Amino acid sequence: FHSFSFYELKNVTNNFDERPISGNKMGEGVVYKGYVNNTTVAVKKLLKQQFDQEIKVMAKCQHENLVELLGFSCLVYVYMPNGSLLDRLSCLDGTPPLSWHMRCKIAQGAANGINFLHENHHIHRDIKSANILLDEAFTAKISDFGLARATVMTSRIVGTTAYMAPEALRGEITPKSDIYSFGVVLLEIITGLPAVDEHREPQLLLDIKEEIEDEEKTIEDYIDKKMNDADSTSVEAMYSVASQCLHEKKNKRPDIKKVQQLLQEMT
Numbered sequence: 079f080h081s082f083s084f085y086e087l088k089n090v091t092n093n094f095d096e097r098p099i100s101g102n103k104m105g106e107g108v109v110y111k112g113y114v115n116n117t118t119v120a121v122k123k124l125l126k127q128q129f130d131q132e133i134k135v136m137a138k139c140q141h142e143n144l145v146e147l148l149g150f151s152c153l154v155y156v157y158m159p160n161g162s163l164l165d166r167l168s169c170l171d172g173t174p175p176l177s178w179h180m181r182c183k184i185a186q187g188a189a190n191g192i193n194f195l196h197e198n199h200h201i202h203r204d205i206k207s208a209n210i211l212l213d214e215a216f217t218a219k220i221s222d223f224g225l226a227r228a229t230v231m232t233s234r235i236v237g238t239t240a241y242m243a244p245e246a247l248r249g250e251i252t253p254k255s256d257i258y259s260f261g262v263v264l265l266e267i268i269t270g271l272p273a274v275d276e277h278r279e280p281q282l283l284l285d286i287k288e289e290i291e292d293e294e295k296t297i298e299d300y301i302d303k304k305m306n307d308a309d310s311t312s313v314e315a316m317y318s319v320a321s322q323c324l325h326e327k328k329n330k331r332p333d334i335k336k337v338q339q340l341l342q343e344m345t
């Protein structure tokens with residue numbers, strides 16, 4: 079890695095411009111746009127124990143479906159031209175909707191990323207569409223390794239509530255919890271709906287699974303209307319994977335290698 083100095087990064091961010099574009103701030107520590115020679119970068123100005131793991135994971139783990147850390151002193155990353163899956167799903171700033179075909183590539187790539195992490199004996203602990211970033215070609219790249227962990231329990235429960243497995247909300251640290259979170263992500267990819275919306279009924283997206291099972295509604299009734307290329311067969315095939323992931327009994331969920339397999343078979 080490139081061992082940076084806090085003054086260089088200030089000028090690249092132009093005195094750390096905490097403002098939109100109409101500045102440098104892209105969103106949120108905080109993340110601002112920048113440049114190093116020609117290389118566009120996202121700098122994360124940040125807890126100390128979290129920074130140690132972020133560098134540990136980024137040094138051990140290198141994959142095309144994971145983000146790349148360039149510098150540290152303030153973690154520095156290759157700017158992602160298409161932001162997060164969350165923002166692209168909600169068409170933030172007027173970006174056009176993702177087609178079914180693009181969404182499949184995203185799901186597939188994100189599973190590959192998780193498989194690489196599970197292969198290298200690591201648990202993400204915070205899989206969510208905001209942590210799935212997209213490059214110039216919309217390749218999915220898993221991000222945020224600060225709370226990552228190399229069955230085990232903790233008294234300090236952390237993550238994003240709407241994405242968390244039941245046993246994860248009880249304290250458990252299992253790689254099977256990441257699988258549950260990925261199933262919520264697959265539901266957002268199908269529906270284009272955020273995992274949680276206070277001004278919505280149901281507020282929680284993982285509740286639609288129950289409505290479908292109790293035949294109150296169909297998966298067809300929940301498919302994102304902001305697409306023209308989705309076919310019932312492959313949509314039902316992604317929902318089936320999502321359903322399997324979202325089993326309340328952690329040992330009844332598929333492993334990431336099988337999730338990865340079911341996504342390939344779909345295309």
Ligand SMILES: Cc1ncc(-c2nc3c(OC4(C)CC4)nc(Nc4cnn(C5CC6(C5)CN(C)C6)c4)nc3cc2F)cn1
Nearest residue numbers: 104105106109120122145155157158159160161162221222
């Ligand atoms: C621990 C950790 N922290 C942060 C990263 C990380 N984060 C981001 C990142 O984070 C955010 C989503 C909050 C802003 N954003 C981006 N790029 C981007 C952000 N917004 N946009 C839009 C998309 C357009 C501009 C509109 N359309 C015309 C192009 C692009 N790259 C990133 C790269 C990274 F490595 C990784 N690991």
